[PDB]
């Protein structure tokens, strides 16, 4: 078996990459905003249906490392496969190179799973896009990367993927700047909360926020915290 499930196109394309990006489109929305002393990945959560126990329901942000976080959009089945594989990569940088992973290493690795399925047959690339962010050890520089299901990656200052990413992108043109990112943890967090309240809306019940602070600090902001930012921003 090696019967192409990825095959070249008459436009000089690959069919499965075009389909993959649309599979990332119809999935959830991720916004990534990086300050000078934090990264923030806030993402859309499907918990619309009632009688769902939101607490034991899978998160949209999964920590891979004690200061490297990963959030996802696209198929929810595929993302969890990557997140098991990344965890192996994380222990392998420690194994042979010591030190926990750099953000940049992990970005090339996710992409390298995608890459594999892109050139070979019997496999197809996952319809998954990620926002990878965090610190490298002994750095207090925020890193914000994006991977896409092609096997391509891009650095960003801000990025958004998912549904109505263009609305959010334009909102951050008028707020966020490459030149001077927010100089505070809370200001960054509130800008990501403000962007999500456009499209995702629907309180702190669908809106999540994860904050990483420099050099081995992962903290999660509970529903209650998220709700307090929501009301203040609404009023303002």
């Amino acid at each position: 078996y090696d019967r192409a499930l990825s095959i070249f196109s008459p436009d000089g394309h690959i069919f499965q990459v075009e389909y993959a990006l649309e599979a990332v489109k119809r999935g959830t929305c991720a916004v990534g905003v990086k300050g000078k002393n934090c990264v923030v990945l806030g993402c859309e959560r499907r918990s619309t249906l009632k009688l769902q126990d939101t607490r034991i329901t899978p998160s949209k942000v999964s920590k891979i490392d004690s200061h490297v976080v990963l959030s996802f959009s696209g198929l929810n089945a595929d993302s969890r496969i990557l997140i098991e594989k990344a965890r192996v990569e994380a222990q392998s940088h420690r194994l042979t190179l010591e030190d926990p992973v750099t953000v940049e290493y992990l970005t090339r690795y996710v992409a390298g799973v995608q890459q594999r399925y892109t050139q070979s047959g019997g496999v197809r690339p996952f319809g998954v896009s990620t926002l990878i962010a965090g610190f490298d050890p002994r750095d207090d520089e925020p890193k914000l990367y994006q991977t896409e299901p092609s096997g391509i990656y891009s650095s960003w200052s801000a990025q958004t993927i998912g549904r109505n990413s263009k609305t959010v992108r334009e909102f951050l043109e008028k707020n966020y700047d490459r030149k001077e990112p927010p100089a505070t943890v809370e200001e960054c967090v509130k800008l990501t909360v403000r962007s999500l309240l456009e499209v995702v809306q629907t309180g702190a019940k669908n809106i999540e926020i994860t904050v990483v602070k420099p050099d081995s600090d992962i903290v999660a902001l509970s529903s209650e915290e998220i709700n307090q930012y929501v009301t203040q921003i609404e009023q303002e």
């Binding site: 990825s6 095959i7 436009d11 092609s150 891009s154 200052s157 043109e173």
Partner: protein, 244 residues
């Protein structure tokens, strides 16, 4: 038809998917390259898509080794496989011989990877279904023939060039190369030549956060020029357009 098989001959008499590979170079952000005997310069268009983009960490300039530089243009999903392979190959040569690898030999190795379409042709292991979709401008300096520039196709074929431009704007670039290439260029006159041809096929304001220059020099090695130097060179081009 002839695109459902990754190894079939067509009623023209040569591969159809390979043609599509040549038409995947025309989706790449232009990479331009001028070789002279004073060193070889590679410039690439990064392409800004938003001011949300971080572009001074993105580049299509790549180091294969100390004495060989590369610029890629086309599908860059494909180029990741090929660049990693180029990096191993160079290091293998230096493992085996304690010696610098020729620019021609290094390029030829990467063409061998490029021919790996099929899943049942010959004996050698096929790790793909199709061809790649990316061309290379591997520049370098070896101590045999001096400075060298090669253009490698995803076909598995390579030519030595004195100047080559690949990417979307390749034909409009190549017209300017015919009239503007000569043997009495300098390193710095070559460097301004890159930006001139790049400015026409640029779709934006030519500046230093969407263009990157790099040299390969014998005595400096492979140096990627910082955006300060790029900004300077860009401004002096406009002064030579203030001469016309």
């Amino acid at each position: 038809e002839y695109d459902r098989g990754v190894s079939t001959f067509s009623p023209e008499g040569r591969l159809f998917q390979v043609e599509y590979s040549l038409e995947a170079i025309k989706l790449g952000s232009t990479a331009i390259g001028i070789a002279t005997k004073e060193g070889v310069v590679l410039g690439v268009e990064k392409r800004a898509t938003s001011p949300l983009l971080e572009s001074d960490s993105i580049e299509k300039i790549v180091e294969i080794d100390r004495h060989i530089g590369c610029a890629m243009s086309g599908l860059t999903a494909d180029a990741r496989s090929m660049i990693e392979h180029a990096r191993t190959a160079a290091v293998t040569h230096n493992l085996y011989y304690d010696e610098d690898i020729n620019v021609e030999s290094l390029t030829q190795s990467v063409c061998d990877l490029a021919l790996r379409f099929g899943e049942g042709a010959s004996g050698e292991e096929r790790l793909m279904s199709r061809p790649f979709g990316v061309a290379l401008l591997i520049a370098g300096h070896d101590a045999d023939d001096g400075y060298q520039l090669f253009h490698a196709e995803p076909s598995g074929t390579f030519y030595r060039y004195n100047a080559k431009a690949i990417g979307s704007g390749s034909e409009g670039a190549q017209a300017e190369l015919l009239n503007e290439w000569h043997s009495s260029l300098t390193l710095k006159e070559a460097e301004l030549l890159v930006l001139k041809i790049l400015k026409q096929v640029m779709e934006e304001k030519l500046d230093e956060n969407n263009a990157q220059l790099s040299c390969i020099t014998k005595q400096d090695g492979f140096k990627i020029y910082d955006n300060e130097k790029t900004a300077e060179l860009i401004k002096e081009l406009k002064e030579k357009e203030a001469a016309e």
